[PDB]
Structure 1
Amino acid sequence: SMSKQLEAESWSRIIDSKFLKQQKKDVVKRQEVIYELMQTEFHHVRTLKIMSGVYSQGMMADLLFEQQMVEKLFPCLDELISIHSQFFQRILERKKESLVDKSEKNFLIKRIGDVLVNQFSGENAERLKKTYGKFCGQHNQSVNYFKDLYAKDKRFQAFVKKKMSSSVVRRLGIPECILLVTQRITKYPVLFQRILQCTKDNEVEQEDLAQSLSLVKDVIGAVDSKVASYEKKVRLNEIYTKTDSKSIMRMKSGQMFAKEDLKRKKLVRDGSVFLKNAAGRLKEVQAVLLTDILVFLQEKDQKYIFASLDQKSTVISLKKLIVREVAHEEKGLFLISMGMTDPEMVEVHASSKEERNSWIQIIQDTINTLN
């Protein structure tokens, strides 16, 4: 079995001593890196399978967790198992066809680049983006859910202690498994890059490897961005619930805006600022820029309310909104709703001139994107 063979700490130890002696240093080095990819992929699959076969299965059977509770700890686990089982088997296939003579021990992989380009392009890439985007995007919630269950659910705690006691190693407790999975994807560029630089005179392999290196970075870049989307969604939900059903704001159109309108909006940026009314008093408020609308909220009685400012709409469509600096006031900024017969102007004051400028740029960017 390969699982038994993969106990070998290095390529130089999995092959015969006689066969090792016949190879150049730079060959040994290159095979050592490929073996490491292969063996750490093996380890990763095993980790996923512990999450599924030990933890998930036990939670469902012993604690009567439904499928959907396990998804709060281990989202997309089945799909991850499918992706990496298949990737790993493709690596084994190439290994098997790289054996030397009738030996089933000694192998020498001349070419791995094509296997990598395939796994990290087309539909395989999209699957990786979608799956890691969701898993990493929910990573902190997943761990937080574990911690709350462990701290407060007596049965869950007892269950976890029993698993740690006998079934699985310390390295693979539940949050540790989650972090192992989240960290896997960013291991690939380092490994691929080292294989490339260890590949000295094979242009098609060098070219493939180069390609796979860039492609995996694109996958990671998209995953990282998707995590930013989840940070924004989770943050918007913090605000939405903090707002209480009580508060309402009329928009320039006449449309009444309320707490439930804040979902399912998409948040761009939020932060504390000050509104300046016509009397010139500064009112502490959360600027909440959404993709289509700008909202201002006062924190009163430990809950958010739609801010009041001289009977003006503080729920503002970005459609025909114009953004200007306040002349001779570096921390200030004007918002003019040109889509009315009496365009309402709203003056807002930041913590600094730097923060004032950044608020103007992102609002302008958000307006430009919208139209």
Structure 2
Amino acid sequence: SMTKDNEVEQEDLAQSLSLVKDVIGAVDSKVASYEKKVRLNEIYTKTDSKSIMRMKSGQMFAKEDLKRKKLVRDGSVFLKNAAGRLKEVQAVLLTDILVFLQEKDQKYIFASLDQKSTVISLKKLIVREVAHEEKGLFLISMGMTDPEMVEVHASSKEERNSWIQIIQDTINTLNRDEDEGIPSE
């Protein structure tokens, strides 16, 4: 608890002590965290409300969730399903979840893969560099019990590490203050 709601209470970029939206001149960047929550509001807005999945714990993770957390990264990456058929999904890395979004019906959906984790609740995620792919990346949920990781194929050989680094970017600053290990957000 950082006296910053549940959505803003992560040192990643939000404190009642430091980190941008502390209470200083940098606190003016909070509205742009609202704006950051606002492309996320948009990305909350196109996203199908009930086209959800069962993430790390097996919960129903939905649109309402995304709403609240921080837009920290966004980019499209392919997803190898059980059949090995790729969907270039709009992956949104948020300070609280790592969510994939399949473009359906002039909007998105949770790219639900009906087995893997198409929305990896942040903090203490496991991110690995696939051996059987040059541009691939596993965004995994092993931190709990059993993940059944999903195949995140980056747009470039580098981009996979470019994405890897981002959990190594976000979660490393999440862990910094907060606890370690959170299921279902």
Q: TM-score of the superposition, structure 1-length normalised?
A: 0.38
Deviations 1:263-299 (CA, angstroms, capped at 9, x unpaired): 2222111111111124322112110111021111111
Assess if the C-alpha contact under 8 Å between 1:292 and 1:370 holds in 2. no
More strand by share: 2
**What secondary structure is seen at the aligned counterpart in 2 of 1:211?**
coil
The structure-2 alpha-carbon separation of the partners of 1:327 and 1:217, relative to structure 1 and needing over 3 Å to count, comes to closer
Answering whether residue 133 of structure 2 is matched by residue 329 of structure 1, we say yes
Ranked by relative contact order (alpha carbons within 8 Å, sequence separation 6 or more), the top structure is 2
Mean CA deviation greater in 245-254 or 267-276: 245-254
The structure-2 alpha-carbon separation of the partners of 1:255 and 1:352, relative to structure 1 and needing over 3 Å to count, comes to same
Between the aligned partners of 1:263 and 1:208, the Cα distance in structure 2 is: 17
Between the aligned partners of 2:52 and 2:133, the Cα distance in structure 1 is: 31
Q: Compute the displacement of 1:235 (Å).
A: 0.6
Assess if the C-alpha contact under 8 Å between 2:12 and 2:173 holds in 1. no
**What secondary structure is seen at the aligned counterpart in 1 of 2:114?**
coil
Deviations 1:194-235 (CA, angstroms, capped at 9, x unpaired): xxxxx9999999999999999999999837855753442221
- Structure with higher Rg: it is 1
The structure-2 alpha-carbon separation of the partners of 1:248 and 1:222, relative to structure 1 and needing over 3 Å to count, comes to same
Q: Compute the displacement of 1:350 (Å).
A: 1.2
Q: TM-score of the superposition, structure 2-length normalised?
A: 0.72
Deviations 1:280-336 (CA, angstroms, capped at 9, x unpaired): 221121101110211111111112111122422312122332111112532111122
1:278 corresponds in structure 2 to: 82
**Identity between Structure 1 and Structure 2 (%):** 100
Between the aligned partners of 2:126 and 2:46, the Cα distance in structure 1 is: 29
Between the aligned partners of 1:306 and 1:229, the Cα distance in structure 2 is: 23
Between the aligned partners of 2:105 and 2:161, the Cα distance in structure 1 is: 31
Assess if the C-alpha contact under 8 Å between 1:276 and 1:348 holds in 2. yes
**What secondary structure is seen at the aligned counterpart in 2 of 1:218?**
coil
The structure-2 alpha-carbon separation of the partners of 1:287 and 1:218, relative to structure 1 and needing over 3 Å to count, comes to closer
Deviations 1:163-213 (CA, angstroms, capped at 9, x unpaired): xxxxxxxxxxxxxxxxxxxxxxxxxxxxxxxxxxxx999999999999999
The structure-2 alpha-carbon separation of the partners of 1:225 and 1:361, relative to structure 1 and needing over 3 Å to count, comes to farther
Provide the aligned length of Structure 1 versus Structure 2: 173
More helix by share: 1
* Aligned-CA RMSD value: 10.4
1:308 corresponds in structure 2 to: 112
Ranges in structure 2 where 5+ consecutive residues have no aligned partner: 176-185
Assess if the C-alpha contact under 8 Å between 1:291 and 1:366 holds in 2. yes
Assess if the C-alpha contact under 8 Å between 2:51 and 2:112 holds in 1. no
Between the aligned partners of 1:256 and 1:305, the Cα distance in structure 2 is: 13
